[PDB]
Structure 1
Amino acid sequence: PRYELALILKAMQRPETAAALKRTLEALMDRGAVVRNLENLGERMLPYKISAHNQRHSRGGYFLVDFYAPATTVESMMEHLSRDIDVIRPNIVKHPLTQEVKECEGIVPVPLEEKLYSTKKR
């Protein structure tokens, strides 16, 4: 994967939830994303009340879409998902599997520093 979409949707039932996911993925495919898979984290009560599209929500479903997308169309994706009203919060990040884990080889113990002051007698 290259990009990851943290997609928090409105809490609603199965058929319009699947329909909203359908039009979201066709919106991605219209801008040209090659989507790998879709992930559901379930529906959870939100950490805080989020105001979006003239409404206050407390419960919402968490979904993840990972894809390969050109760098110019991410703004178009964010604009379309901003105008979409069945989503409460879309965000696009670089996927963490792109970077590789550099090695924690251990904590190097730092010496206390020498030679900071002159050898004058106080």
Structure 2
Amino acid sequence: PRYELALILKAMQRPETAAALKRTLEALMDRGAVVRNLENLGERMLPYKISAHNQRHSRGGYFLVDFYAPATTVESMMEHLSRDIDVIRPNIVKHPLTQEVKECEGIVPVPLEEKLYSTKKR
């Protein structure tokens, strides 16, 4: 997976939410995207009140869209999602599953530094 779209949607009923998700996904496929998956993180009360589109929002729905897109297009998508009034806040991140975990082999302990000063007898 290449990009990860973190989507925070206005908290709404079933049909309208499905609607927004649909037109958003379409909007993605239109900029040339291939959508791998859609996940739902549920609706929660937001960490802090978010002001967007002349509305101050308390709650919201959370979604992940993993997808492949040409490098060029991210900006484009962003623009779109900015002017959508049903989106509380967009973000697009290089997918966490592209970066792979190197091995902590342990903690190499650091010896106390030596020869910082001369052998002078005070």
1:2-32 deviation line (CA, Å, top 9, x unaligned):
0000000000000010000000000000001
User: Unaligned stretches of 5+ in structure 2?
Assistant: none
**TM-score normalised over the length of structure 1:** 0.99
Structure 1 residues 28-63: Cα deviation after superposition (integer angstroms, max 9, x where no partner) = 000011010100000000000000000000000000
Unaligned runs of 5+ in 1: none
Shift of 1:110: 0.4
Superimposed CA distance per residue, residues 68-107 of structure 1 (whole angstroms, 9 cap, x where no aligned partner): 0011100000000001010010000000100110111100
What does residue 14 of structure 1 align with?
14
Match of 1:82, SS state, is helix
Cα deviation for residue 108 of structure 1 reads 0.3
Q: TM-score, normalised by structure 2?
A: 0.99
Aligned residues: 122
SS where residue 72 of structure 1 aligns? helix
Secondary structure of the corresponding residue to residue 73 of structure 1: helix
Which runs of 4 or more aligned residues in structure 1 lie more than 4 Å from their structure 2 counterparts after TM superposition?
none
CA RMSD of aligned residues (A): 0.4
